[PDB]
Write a protein that binds this ligand. Structure first.
Ligand SMILES: CCCCCCCCCCO[C@@H]1O[C@H](CO)[C@@H](O[C@H]2O[C@H](CO)[C@@H](O)[C@H](O)[C@H]2O)[C@H](O)[C@H]1O
Ligand SMILES: CCCCCCCCCCO[C@@H]1O[C@H](CO)[C@@H](O[C@H]2O[C@H](CO)[C@@H](O)[C@H](O)[C@H]2O)[C@H](O)[C@H]1O
Ligand SMILES: CCCCCCCCCCO[C@@H]1O[C@H](CO)[C@@H](O[C@H]2O[C@H](CO)[C@@H](O)[C@H](O)[C@H]2O)[C@H](O)[C@H]1O
Ligand SMILES: CCCCCCCCCCO[C@@H]1O[C@H](CO)[C@@H](O[C@H]2O[C@H](CO)[C@@H](O)[C@H](O)[C@H]2O)[C@H](O)[C@H]1O
Ligand SMILES: CCCCCCCCCCO[C@@H]1O[C@H](CO)[C@@H](O[C@H]2O[C@H](CO)[C@@H](O)[C@H](O)[C@H]2O)[C@H](O)[C@H]1O
Ligand SMILES: CC(C)(C)OC(=O)c1ncn2c1[C@@H]1CCCN1C(=O)c1c(Br)cccc1-2
Ligand SMILES: CC(C)(C)OC(=O)c1ncn2c1[C@@H]1CCCN1C(=O)c1c(Br)cccc1-2
Ligand SMILES: CC(C)(C)OC(=O)c1ncn2c1[C@@H]1CCCN1C(=O)c1c(Br)cccc1-2
Ligand SMILES: CC(C)(C)OC(=O)c1ncn2c1[C@@H]1CCCN1C(=O)c1c(Br)cccc1-2
Ligand SMILES: CC(C)(C)OC(=O)c1ncn2c1[C@@H]1CCCN1C(=O)c1c(Br)cccc1-2
Ligand SMILES: *[C@@H]1O[C@H](CO)[C@@H](O)[C@H](O)[C@H]1NC(C)=O
Ligand SMILES: *[C@@H]1O[C@H](CO)[C@@H](O)[C@H](O)[C@H]1NC(C)=O
Ligand SMILES: *[C@@H]1O[C@H](CO)[C@@H](O)[C@H](O)[C@H]1NC(C)=O
Ligand SMILES: *[C@@H]1O[C@H](CO)[C@@H](O)[C@H](O)[C@H]1NC(C)=O
Ligand SMILES: *[C@@H]1O[C@H](CO)[C@@H](O)[C@H](O)[C@H]1NC(C)=O
Lengths: 335, 334, 336, 336, 334
């Protein structure tokens, strides 16, 4: 134990953590790996998502070289503050924090070679802009851009470990989402010239497909059961004017209320979604049904044969014209 | 210039004691306070509080900070506030108080050759203000902002204002939808307690509510519903279901409308001026339905009364609501 | 004058080890505590918690801070509180709390020639207040505030309340006002608890409260009472107006249904019925019964018009009375 | 005496390197851990998480902390915890957490002559509780709390539960109450996991819960069951009252739609049906069927008045039984 | 060599007083500022505020940092930023803000031989954006971002934009992220303001926005337009169908009432009507008029069946035209 205390003091004695390793001589290469402990709740309304990861970085620091009986140096966060570490920052980060209980969740391991292994646990909320045209049969891709803030590529460079495959791992238990399937992950790296230098930002893309089950129960079934209800009016006689009216007047507003209700939970986007269109025609079908009764009742006294006919015909054309719409609707957006 | 000032500061901090107030055992330090309100944030009658953004300032004399030099003032940043003595000023009715740390601690420290110190910091405060919203939405309130020393009673520390006691900023930036800033007054006093007799300093802000929102959100839909219920008078009793819908649905909406109105408001036990408006409107609507039931119970047997009731309702029901509206508005309008 | 106090402080802190409690190995440090509630924070029924803004004072004696000087006390800032030893008092039932910090930390340190220390601070604390809501909205609740040392059992540190003069618990008239509850009163207590890490002395401050019924009278009871009375107006119509009679019942039963769910959403998700729940239940029975009354009358109006018509005439007097008597017994039961 | 303890502390910390765990290169640091749940925090189904307030204790041996003195143990504050080495234990499934700090950090350090350390602290932790809601609201859910070291694999640090005389996991009787769940019990566990940075030993604390049906019986089931019977009241009316019969069906069919969406808005947006959803689904079928019954009856009332009238009489007894038969099987199925 | 830079840093910071601005007593510290909006954060109409994620850069010259070495610029971390003097810039209209901290504080310090300092940082800022919603939802809003020093007036520190006004503020094309607004453009400005604590130079960056009408077309306008059309279907029924005609009127008037409250709940509780309110207001008039029309015809249907029939056949052409013309005038106006 006493031997290692002197090793640490010898490495940190006269060690300036304010300067990156290789300043003015070599670029600091940082191989990075990532393990997603859990994929956090995705907020469509806020166009963001949360993620809890173990973010590891390894670089070579010659000032930390040493010869001893051990092969490395398992240490705590205590030493991480005393040495130099990369100033990595997540570009598209909204709000994030490093877990601190029981102690700062950090790990420092130093090798005789001088290579440093520096991993930490982070929960990050980042922006994930979405296009919701195909909602709720939609797929989304959420990025995670990160890189150095003060050191361009001429001084610090990032690269993925093990190659672009298996560089990023995700715990199967932690990718829990109520509304999305986590299809897969793809990594990337690109240099970008900025007015403060050309930095190398590395990205981790998370592709997602939305689950239709929830909206089937909350929106689609309530709408489909309301359109068929409006069509029951056709099976009544024009003599029951009030009854026929109650059917139409109520089902059109039920359809209106379902629209506003179904949209309140979604982001206030200024364009229609696949759910909106479905609701739109369902409103047309119910409104058409009520308009059908208004027509028969207006001509039932002058053209009772035509008015009566139009009732018998509506009992078959409306369901087919709606049933055929669902066939094309669900086939188009699920293809 | 730079080197000179550096030595003036180092020579004033070598034998200095941050943990000790000036005029300790000698006299009571006088603190001339001033305040500039940047904005008046949202009022939250639910938790009986309100937000406020201010530049708060304290100016005391510290003997230990006397320096002889050619320069007049030492315009410095916040890095010196922790290395000199600072009053323990705290706010007696604040639910939470926050400072501003971007880009730097939003504080300034100015020192004169005389030993006078100017220390002002940006603050945002959530002060508690109990609201007697009985005349709501036609209610008038005044809300305080008390602050005194936490540990130096009257003998050790004392406060007083300037003639620039308070200074308000651009009122358009202020996010006060339902209220309008009108008044601002200051008060000094000494409250007695067990730990001592502290001199407390309060600044009241006076706010008068606006009806515009509630007029469109509540009063109008209430005024139109009673009217709709009275259109039922211009129908025959043959169409019983028709006039039954009129009454049943209107009492239904005046009910939902009341709950929708109170949901967004604090859960006060007493009744407000609006609750009364909503209550009597419900009566105007409910009274219209029972009128039809009475007329219906008479139509079949005795069409004498069943006919003249509607004739008089079409005059009284509308005219009795309008007189009530004049009574209601004029009572609170002035 | 000023230089004298600077040297006094330096002499006291010179060689002072704040890692050790005063009297370690000789005497147990007794901590007399007083409390002043600056404001009783909003009570959250849904979260079963309450907030409170207090001035929490602790006084003990430190043999190492004995000094002789001109003035008898030492008015100091919070800066010294960190340099000396202070008790590690913690609130057992605390959920989340914080110490006020503006303009400076709301704390005060006063040291006497004797060595006695006075250490008071301003704290806003949200603590758990488990509630039994059987009598809701006519319920009374008692919210505790347990606190004590975390690392020092009774063998090392002990807490005690102050004498009567310095009231153990005080509550500012400015702060206790609550929109939904009355703060009846407060009672203190002290008790030892044997734990696997020692026997600690926890001190408790209980705050008893009864809910204000005004809000629910306006939001739930009146809508329910007026909806049952509305349903009974159906009796004043003829059976010939079948649709009309139906509109009364069908609408009022759902009006009562909606009033339930609406009244049911805002309250804590407790899995047992409250006094309000039963009230809503009976109003639903009376409204549903009224609609069922017409369905029976309309079913026998063709075969027994004399019986069908007469029961409509009695339903007008049995329903209101039977409901009026229900309200009389209901409101009398839960008010006493 | 006080000066004696000052020298003891200085002797232990003199030349003490807290950057190195005890036994580096000599022995693996074994950390026996105990836990006491001061309160089991609110469970958030929508957020799939739960809160918990625990006293988390760890005990290990540090040779460098060997001292010889009059007192056997050393009751200390958090000040010494920062100066010595402590395990870097972390909760894997943590969402957001914090250690209570008022008035001082809620921490306790006790050192015995042997060198054994007792290190316990108070923690409020929000952790993930993945839930399966197929049997909702009659389901059982288990919330884990897996924890272990972050930088020291099993080859350097090992965790183990308290073998005897202390139940490894304790739950305060005062804190365990929950508005929506019963806390059935707790089960502990230990497991090695091979990772690219070593094989760590994570220790698990499972908290098993079964949901309380009381809230949903009144909020969803009764409103649904009372709405289905309402739709069946239509059978007691004449076919001539088409509008009346229509008002019944259209109104109850939409009421059932509203109850569905309403009951699901408060729940997590899961993409699968629950036992409540199915219950609502069939209840929608029964009401829609009732309206469908009148639509059929009303269509043949002129051509087959004997059949139309006849089916109205059997529908009055088959529908209630056919719904009552569903409830018998439904409630028996999920409640056994 | 690394050791060479270690001595350079120590020599510069040795005896360095960060409490004093560079050029104190000789020259005013000029601070050239640049800004890059990494993303334009959500705008909260209810709160009259907006969020923004920027890289905020400031550059000034400090003679005390003049150094001679191998590399002519010094790429450094935040560690040194606290040890030297930096401007105390603060955003006046700031509500609440913070500097990103992961993995390390998002800050950058670069020093040159000349002594020029480059100090940039990443900030997420929530600031006040006072709005006038008369033309809501067809409105344009401008959100400011005033910033400047807190303790140094123009006599001590002065701010200026880089490379003139042009290109001083940039916005990432990926970062222009608003669901409800278009980010038209940005314009900068500078102005001196005399205050009781000195004459400071505040620099402002205005962000102009035009609201997107798509969301409200689906949530408010179409429900309103289709509900008025629904009410007019009543004209195509006979007065004999009193209950039916009543059901139309009774239902559409309350539907329109409900839509107002619904549409109004999401908006700020402003005490004045918006373009949406008026649109809803007339749609309520159109539906209520239709119900009143039936009440009139049904009142005279027996006495003047020719006139009662005439007003029905007339409502079928006058109501749609008067509403269609209103939308033509309404939508054409804005
Ligand atoms: C014919 C015209 C009828 C008049 C218009 C009717 C207006 C009332 C519609 C209510 O619909 C609900 O509104 C909630 C609040 O907007 C939504 O809550 C959901 O979404 C909200 C916003 O994202 C969240 O605050 C909630 O927690 C979440 O449950 C919910 O999904 C939606 O069904
Ligand atoms: C037939 C019997 C009666 C049945 C009644 C059923 C319907 C109840 C009416 C609901 O009305 C809404 O309630 C919200 C609360 O639920 C309010 O939200 C407002 O106030 C809330 C609480 O202050 C905030 O959370 C919201 O953000 C804010 O929009 C909103 O203004 C109000 O219009
Ligand atoms: C179909 C039936 C719909 C009933 C709607 O009734 C409303 O539901 C809200 C559901 O949110 C309640 O909100 C109240 O209670 C909620 C539950 O805590 C809070 O979130 C709200 O802010 C508060 O206004 C509100 O009182 C209640 O009238
Ligand atoms: C007939 C055709 C039209 C379909 C029906 C339209 C009306 C929709 C019913 C709304 O019912 C309410 O929805 C809230 C959410 O929107 C729920 O709030 C609950 O759940 C929310 C989200 O979980 C929380 O934010 C609230 O605080 C909590 O009270 C609340 O329980 C529920 O009664
Ligand atoms: C004529 C008969 C009587 C009618 C009385 C009113 C009936 C009920 C209307 C409720 O309308 C909803 O209210 C929500 C709560 O106020 C709004 O939520 C929206 O706005 C709220 C406040 O900004 C947010 O809290 C929510 O998350 C957001 O979804 C929502 O948009 C709105 O459609
Ligand atoms: C994958 C990567 C190198 C970026 O990860 C770490 O470097 C890291 N950092 C911390 N930990 C890890 C390892 C690696 C595999 C996942 N993993 C863990 O989950 C874990 C565990 Br089970 C217990 C204690 C520490 C860690
Ligand atoms: C007069 C008073 C003591 C109440 O003054 C402050 O409290 C204060 N403290 C800081 N600042 C101010 C002055 C006051 C007038 C407006 N005003 C400012 O807004 C401001 C500005 Br523009 C830039 C830099 C500092 C300040
Ligand atoms: C009673 C106790 C020792 C527990 O006292 C405090 O803890 C305390 N701490 C600070 N202050 C107080 C006293 C106590 C009585 C009311 N009271 C105050 O409210 C107050 C006031 Br008005 C101004 C300045 C300081 C205080
Ligand atoms: C059980 C366990 C070892 C895991 O617990 C602690 O080690 C611990 N840590 C702190 N405290 C305790 C004891 C143990 C029993 C519960 N218990 C307490 O509740 C308590 C009390 Br009443 C007052 C002061 C400190 C504590
Ligand atoms: C434009 C301005 C001077 C106000 O900006 C900076 O001074 C700054 N500050 C930090 N960074 C930058 C550059 C400039 C362009 C945007 N930009 C970046 O996004 C970026 C990146 Br990709 C990686 C590392 C650092 C930065
Ligand atoms: C970006 O810079 C790195 C480091 O010089 C280099 O390896 C890489 O090839 C460059 N571009 C791309 C597209 O990889
Ligand atoms: C400062 O000025 C006062 C008054 O002239 C004088 O008494 C004192 O000696 C001066 N101090 C110094 C350091 O010059
Ligand atoms: C209060 O404010 C007024 C107006 O500025 C001022 O004249 C008066 O002196 C102030 N009084 C106190 C006690 O501050
Ligand atoms: C608490 O401890 C003291 C000292 O041992 C004892 O006198 C007192 O009776 C104890 N109180 C309880 C409730 O056990
Ligand atoms: C983990 O590894 C250690 C060392 O081999 C062993 O003693 C222990 O039994 C293992 N635990 C499990 C759960 O496999």
């Amino acid at each position: 134990i006493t031997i290692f205390t002197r090793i640490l003091d010898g490495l940190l004695d006269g060690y300036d953590n304010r300067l990156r390793p290789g300043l003015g001589e070599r670029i600091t290469q940082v191989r990075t790996d990532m393990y997603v402990n859990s994929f956090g709740p995705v907020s469509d309304t806020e166009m963001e998502y949360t993620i809890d990861i173990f973010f590891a970085q390894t670089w070579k620091d010659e000032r930390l070289r040493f010869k001893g009986p051990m092969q490395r140096l398992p240490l705590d966060n205590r030493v991480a503050d005393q040495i130099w570490t990369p100033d990595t920052f997540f570009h598209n980060d909204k709000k994030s924090f490093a877990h601190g209980m029981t102690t700062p969740n950090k790990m420092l391991r130093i090798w005789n070679d001088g290579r440093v292994l520096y991993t930490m646990r982070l929960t990050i909320s980042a922006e994930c802009p979405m296009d919701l045209e195909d909602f709720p049969m939609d797929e989304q891709n959420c990025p995670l851009k990160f890189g150095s803030y003060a050191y361009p590529n001429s001084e610090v460079v990032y690269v993925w470990t093990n190659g672009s495959t298996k560089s990023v791992v995700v715990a199967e238990d932690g990718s829990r989402l109520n509304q999305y399937h986590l299809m897969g992950q793809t990594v990337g790296t690109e240099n970008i010239s900025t007015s403060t230098g050309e930095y190398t930002i590395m990205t981790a893309h998370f592709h997602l497909k939305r689950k239709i089950g929830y909206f089937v129960i909350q929106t689609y079934l309530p709408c489909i059961m309301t359109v068929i209800l409006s069509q029951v009016s056709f099976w009544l006689n024009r003599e029951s004017v009030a009854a026929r009216t109650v059917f139409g007047v109520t089902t059109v507003l039920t359809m209106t209320t379902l629209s506003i209700s179904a949209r309140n939970s979604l982001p206030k986007v200024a364009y229609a979604t696949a759910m909106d269109w479905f609701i739109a025609v369902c409103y047309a079908f119910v409104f058409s049904a009520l308009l059908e009764f208004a027509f028969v009742n207006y001509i039932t006294k002058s053209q009772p044969a035509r008015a009566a006919k139009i009732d018998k015909m509506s009992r078959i054309v409306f369901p087919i014209l709606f049933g055929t719409f669902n066939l094309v609707y669900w086939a188009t957006y699920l293809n | 210039p730079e080197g000179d000032v550096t030595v003036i500061l180092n020579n004033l901090l070598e034998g200095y004691d941050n943990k000790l107030r000036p005029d300790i055992g000698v006299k009571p330090t006088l603190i001339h306070t001033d305040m500039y309100v940047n904005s008046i944030g949202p009022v939250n009658a639910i938790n009986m509080e309100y937000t406020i953004d201010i530049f708060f300032a304290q100016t005391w004399y510290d003997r230990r900070l006397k320096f002889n030099s050619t320069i007049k003032v030492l315009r410095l940043n916040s890095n010196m506030v922790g290395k000199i003595w600072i009053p323990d000023t705290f706010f007696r009715n604040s639910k939470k108080a926050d400072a501003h740390w971007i880009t730097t601690p939003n504080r300034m420290l100015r020192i004169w050759n005389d030993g006078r110190v100017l220390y002002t910091l940006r603050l945002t405060i959530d002060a508690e203000c109990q609201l007697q919203l009985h005349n709501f939405p036609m209610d008038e309130h005044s809300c305080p902002l008390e602050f005194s020393s936490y540990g130096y009673p009257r003998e050790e520390i004392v406060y007083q204002w300037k003639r620039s006691s308070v200074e308000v900023g651009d009122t358009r930036s202020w996010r006060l939808y339902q209220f309008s800033f009108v008044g601002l007054r200051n008060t000094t006093e000494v409250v007695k307690t067990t730990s001592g007799d502290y001199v407390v300093m309060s600044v009241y802000f006076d706010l008068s509510r606006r009806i515009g929102y509630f007029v469109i959100q509540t009063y109008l839909p209430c005024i139109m519903t009673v009217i709709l219920s009275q259109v039922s008078f211009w129908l025959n009793r043959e169409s019983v279901a028709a006039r039954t819908v009129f009454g049943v649905t209107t009492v239904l909406t005046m009910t939902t409308l009341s709950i929708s109105a109170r949901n967004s408001l604090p859960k006060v036990a007493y009744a407000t001026a609006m609750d009364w408006f909503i209550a009597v409107c419900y009566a105007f609507v409910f009274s219209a339905l029972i009128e039809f039931a009475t007329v219906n119970y008479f139509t079949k047997s005795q069409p004498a009364r069943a006919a003249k009731i509607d004739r008089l309702s079409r005059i009284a029901f509308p005219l009795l609501f309008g007189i009530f509206n004049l009574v209601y508005w004029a009572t609170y309008l002035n």
